[PDB]
């Protein structure tokens, strides 16, 4: 039972890692966009 529970928990953790990776990449793209936007605004 512990083996099955840890298998399920590992699968859930991997799914959560995938979701968090998607969210982190979205945040990274947003941060780069914000940085370049404010740098271009300061330059102009």
């Amino acid at each position: 039972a512990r083996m099955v529970a840890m298998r399920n928990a590992t699968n859930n953790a991997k799914d959560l890692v995938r979701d968090l990776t998607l969210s982190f990449n979205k945040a990274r793209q947003a941060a780069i966009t914000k940085e370049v936007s404010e740098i271009a605004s300061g330059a102009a």
Partner: protein, 468 residues
């Protein structure tokens, strides 16, 4: 008077006037435009030797440089009074319904007025029953105060607004004003017309007690920018004479987005994500006019659209500080088929006070938040480890929290178009009693699926007995 257009940048028109006849900051100028119909622009800036920058509030896509502009000398004047009741207007105050134009004898008031002073502020407020369980329990709708719903694209802001209007528009005890700033002309209007004209209050329809100013998504930025001010001017007359006003503004965001487009065309230095530098001041100038004073009360219900699903966007972040009651609609709740979609933990209200709303109501609301706060604290543990690892009382609180989430769902009378569930009107007392019984333990044996799309607790019990 009698200037000439120099530049036409988008909907922003720069015009040169004589040196001693420059229009004021908020005056309205007019392009004859031929054909007997004229384009009414509103000055925004004064740039120098008779040059003024104005916002077209119109198509402004068929006029050339060098066209003459006539200075009216006054800001936009809209009709006010009982003559505006039961009529539909533009941003300019010109009716668009089939009925005739407003007569000259009707008073014309400028759409730009000072908000009520600090003396005139009326801080007295009381609960307004709306028949929606989550609204009347977690974030009570406030009579004489400012409230709004902040929802994403896919959530049901329009459904909630229409249900609210259907519930509270028959027993108005006063007139009402609806402003359709930046909203679909399919549902936002022309089917609120169908519902408002169908509703009858002792042989007088609800539409006969309503002033509706539109300026919707199709209009250029200027119309969406000043339609809110026009509606406020039409409602301030009724407030000043003592009549209670139900004010329903749609997508205050769309008001802010237009300001953003106007500022971008005006050449102002952009702030944050392309927004205007004068975002806070514009929001204040519009919202401080939406206040209940000592002469009359305005019961205002607003909607706010959050770009993408970002509640940290400057527009909703600016709105949040101008409200008595906040109701946050989340996409995650909506995608769970919970069509009310209100997040109890992100929805607050100032009148949720045991002196104002009642001791039992206050206790029930605080407990319904403490539960679902214990649930939000355990979302990850349930996600990874599962339900079993929690303690017994934690399991009970999580089960009750999920039951409460299902129970906040409620069918709406205006949702019959796409949902087969008949509408339900749950009084605030019934909602409080149902949630108190749910928190006590009654209904623990009931499966959670029986709390979905129900009214008070008696309906859930009856459904359970029907399922045996």
């Amino acid at each position: 008077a009698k200037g000439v257009i120099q530049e036409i940048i988008g909907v922003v028109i720069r015009a040169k006037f004589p040196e001693d006849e420059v229009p004021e900051i908020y005056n309205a100028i007019e392009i004859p435009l031929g054909n007997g119909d004229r384009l009414v622009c509103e000055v925004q800036q004064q740039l120098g030797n008779g040059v003024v920058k104005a916002v077209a509030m119109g198509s402004t896509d068929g006029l050339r440089r060098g066209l003459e502009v006539i200075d009216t000398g006054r800001p936009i004047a809209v009709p006010v009074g009982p003559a505006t009741l039961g009529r539909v207007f533009n941003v300019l105050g010109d009716p668009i319904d089939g009925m005739g134009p407003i007569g000259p004898e009707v008073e014309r008031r400028p759409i730009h007025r000072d908000p009520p002073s600090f003396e005139e502020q009326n801080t007295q407020a009381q609960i307004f029953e709306t028949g929606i369980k989550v609204i009347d329990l977690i974030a009570p709708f406030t009579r004489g105060g400012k409230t709004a719903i902040f929802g994403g694209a896919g959530v049901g802001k329009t459904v909630v607004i229409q249900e609210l209007i259907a519930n509270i528009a028959k027993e108005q005890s006063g007139f009402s004003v609806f402003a359709g700033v930046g909203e679909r002309s399919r549902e936002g209007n022309d089917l609120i017309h169908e519902m408002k004209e169908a509703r009858i209050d002792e042989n007088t329809t609800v539409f006969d007690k309503t002033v509706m100013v539109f300026g919707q998504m199709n209009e250029p930025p200027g119309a969406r920018l000043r339609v809110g001010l026009t509606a406020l001017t039409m409602a301030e007359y009724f407030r000043d004479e003592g009549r209670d006003i139900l004010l329903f503004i749609d997508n205050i965001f769309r008001f802010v987005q237009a300001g953003s487009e106007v500022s971008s065309l005006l050449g102002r230095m952009p702030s944050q994500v392309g927004y205007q530098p004068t975002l806070g001041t514009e929001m204040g100038e519009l919202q401080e006019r939406i206040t209940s004073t000592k002469r009359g009360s305005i019961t205002s219900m607003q909607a706010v659209y959050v770009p993408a699903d970002d509640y940290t966007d400057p527009a909703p972040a600016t709105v949040f500080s101008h409200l008595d009651a906040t109701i946050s609609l989340e996409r995650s709740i909506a995608e769970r088929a919970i069509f009310p979609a209100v997040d109890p933990l992100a929805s607050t209200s100032r009148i949720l006070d045991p002196n104002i709303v009642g001791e039992e109501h206050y206790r029930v609301a605080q407990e319904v938040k403490r539960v679902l706060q214990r649930y939000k604290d355990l979302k990850d543990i349930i996600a990874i480890l599962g339900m079993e690892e929690l303690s017994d009382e934690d399991k009970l609180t999580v089960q009750r929290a999920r039951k409460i989430e299902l129970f906040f769902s409620q069918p709406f009378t205006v949702a019959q178009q796409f949902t087969g569930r008949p509408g339900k009107y749950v009084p605030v007392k019934k909602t409080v009693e149902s949630f108190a019984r749910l928190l006590n333990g009654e209904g623990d044996h009931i499966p959670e699926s029986f709390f979905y799309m129900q009214g008070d607790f008696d309906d859930v019990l009856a459904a359970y007995e029907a399922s045996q």
